[PDB]
Amino acid sequence: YPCPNTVDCFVSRPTEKTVFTVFMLAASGICIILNVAEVVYLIIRAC
């Protein structure tokens, strides 16, 4: 509301935004894996 029925809307630069989303998500996933590896190394250092 208040759009009548269903309306079409158009997104700005969807392809470029998709590319940058892939880059940022890949970097975040690398960060996650690296943080797990660092925690495991700390545990090994404790033992």
Next chain:
Amino acid sequence: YPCPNTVDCFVSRPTEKTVFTVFMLAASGICIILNVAEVVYLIIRAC
């Protein structure tokens, strides 16, 4: 087509047009009944 999805459209003077439609349909129905009566009278005149 080519209207996207479903669109709302607005009719000009719907109430006045309805009134005149009722008048014309009533007159046409009266004409139909009267024509049947005239045919029946002609048949009776034949007999």
